[model samples]
Target: RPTVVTVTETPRNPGSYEVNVERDGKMVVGRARAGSDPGAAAAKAMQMAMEWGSPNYVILGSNKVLAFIPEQLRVKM
Candidate 1:
């Protein structure tokens, strides 16, 4: 199934911080600030993944600071 994901910046900070991923009909997924350390960002991204019930699909930017659905909920294409 195709899922709709929405990424938005936190009300407090516009560019410096953001909460990404809001899947329709499922759970809401999001990510926060990761000042430095790519590994740390990845960890945080994974943490959000876990929090959102480990979504099957994920969309992420090149920076990797933001990540969305990691896998598709549906088994078959």
Candidate 2:
């Protein structure tokens, strides 16, 4: 199974957040500091993962995925 972890500003401020999806002690998906827009962040993360050549990408939800990319930065996911 996959997990979705959200990191948002405390008290719902007008900032960004992170979402991490991990499975079996490994980080399958990671998106960071996505500007309050979950969908955009997810898309950016997916794009980054794709650029990094991740072979096993799983779309866990409309705004989440399961994949592995070791070279990406830590934004909010």
Candidate 3:
């Protein structure tokens, strides 16, 4: 199956940051440790998404047609 992912930037807290990850717009488990920059946060969130389900496409604050099949991924998307 195809797995879509969402990387979101939540703006409300600083000195600490978080990315709300979603699968096909439905929120999933993806979190980063508080310490440094947005880059780090995004990186961590991306990692988390991969962990939850091998996603091929990642939509910011969103997701699309999706699933997970042994790390299979989409390139054009």
Candidate 4:
């Protein structure tokens, strides 16, 4: 399994965004940011994982797959 973080905008709350980090079924989700700021939310989420747990994480957005690699940045597909 791949270590991953999922960034999703909230449907119930307008302009609010959510970040979820998962590993081996255990995960953490929070409202990381507000406004149309998915990128920043994911950035913070990736950083959160980097500091708390998980090394490198792939950030899965609504339509993009962003793998958080410090050396290479992000991957979109």
Best TM-score among the predictions, by candidate number: 4
Superposed Cα RMSD, model 3: 8.0
lDDT tens readout by residue for model 4, 5-63: 66777888755567776776777655555235555565665675565445555665654
Considering every candidate listed, which one attains the maximal lDDT? 4
Please identify which of the two predictions, 3 or 4, would achieve the higher lDDT against the true structure.
4
Q: After superposition, how far is residue 9 of candidate 1 from its true place, in Å?
A: 12
Give the clashing residue pairs of candidate 4, or none. none
> In model 2, which runs have C-alpha deviations exceeding 4 angstroms?
1-17, 21-24, 28-31, 51-53, 61-77
Native-to-model Cα distance after best TM-score fit, residue 61 in candidate 1, in Å: 3.1
Task: Compute the lDDT of residue 43 as modeled in candidate 3.
Answer: 54
For each candidate, the alpha-carbon lDDT, in order, equals: 0.43, 0.43, 0.44, 0.57
- TM-score for all predictions? 0.42, 0.36, 0.44, 0.58
lDDT of 3 by residue, 4-72 (tens): 444444456543455554556566655544234545554554555566545454434322112221224
lDDT of 2 at 25: 62
Cα-based RMSD of candidate 1 = 6.1
Q: Could you tell me the TM-score of candidate 4?
A: 0.58
lDDT of 2 by residue, 1-77 (tens): 32333333324654444545554567655654545555555555556444432444333332222222232432323
Candidate 3: pairs in clash: 2-66, 2-67, 3-67
